[PDB]
A and B are shown apart, each in its own frame.
With several copies, the nearest count.
Chain A
């Protein structure tokens, strides 16, 4: 599964 990119808002 895909998880979030590190850089985020």
Chain B
């Protein structure tokens, strides 16, 4: 790997520089190099890994949606034929997005998840696994769509089971997991009622636990709670 000769601490330092410079592809390459050193990641380092790849795949998802929309319009009645180029280029972006998702899933499988024993690491990684299968599901159309969806569901479900047993209902990881599993239900799994029920129960159980929190923890939790509320407003 191109980062094999760089010190772990230098990779982490440069990932933070890349974040400041909004160089998310570099950030992701640095964090991949850090993961491949073989040591477990700290909380901050897990956040860096996620920030880096979320921004990379975010740009790809946004581009994919633009191109897919153009492609679908080209397939309407009365649309002039323009050749294979829209499909080809959508496929190019799609393949690169799938590559990034596969890279993240590979890091999680070799060997972040199997070494993660604490709830805060294990839930974070299983949520990521669900997320990157969800991003794969957004573009899936063939014989493996169902299996990709079930892989996302399975990872989210294992994360949910641990988070409910081991974390308070205000924990931001637990909240962000529930938020994302609810998005999965609504947007991927054709289960809007499950999405709404999960968002509401998650919000209400967190509300009831806010009284236990410091001012700073209250701010962290309410930020994610507001996203649940925003989704419920969109969906109801």
Say if the two chains contact directly (CB < 8 Å).
yes
Minimum Cβ distance to chain B for residue A3 (Å): 5
Contact residue among B50, B183, B220, B231 (Cβ-Cβ distance under 8 Å from A6):
B50
Contacts of A3 in B (CB 8 A): 131, 179-180, 183, 227
Minimum Cβ distance to chain A for residue B59 (Å): 13
* B47–A4 touching, CB < 8 Å: no
Complex CA distance for A6 and B180, rounded to whole angstroms? 11
Minimum Cβ distance to chain B for residue A5 (Å): 7
Say yes or no for B194: interface residue by CB 8 A criterion: no
Name A5's closest neighbour in chain B (CB-CB).
B176
Q: Interface readout for B175-212 with A: 1 if CB under 8 Å, 0 if not?
A: 11101100100110000000000000000000000000
Size category of the A interface is under 10
Name B178's closest neighbour in chain A (CB-CB).
A4
What number of residue pairs across chains A and B have CB atoms under 8 A from each other? 50
Q: Interface readout for B28-55 with A: 1 if CB under 8 Å, 0 if not?
A: 0000000000000001001100110111
Contacts of B230 in A (CB 8 A): 2
Contacts of A1 in B (CB 8 A): 183, 186-187, 231, 234-235
Say yes or no for B148: interface residue by CB 8 A criterion: no
Complex CA distance for A3 and B177, rounded to whole angstroms? 9
* B172–A9 touching, CB < 8 Å: yes
Contacts of B46 in A (CB 8 A): 8
Contacts of A5 in B (CB 8 A): 176, 223-224
5 additional A-B pairs beyond A5-B223, A8-B176, beta carbons within 8 Å, are: A1-B186, A2-B183, A5-B176, A9-B167, A9-B220
The 24 sampled A-B contact pairs (Cβ below 8 Å) are: A1-B183, A1-B186, A1-B235, A2-B183, A2-B227, A3-B227, A4-B175, A4-B176, A4-B180, A4-B224, A5-B176, A5-B223, A5-B224, A6-B47, A6-B51, A6-B53, A6-B54, A6-B55, A7-B50, A8-B50, A8-B176, A9-B120, A9-B167, A9-B220
Minimum-distance CB pairs A-B, first 9: A4-B176, A6-B54, A6-B50, A7-B47, A6-B51, A2-B227, A9-B173, A8-B173, A1-B183
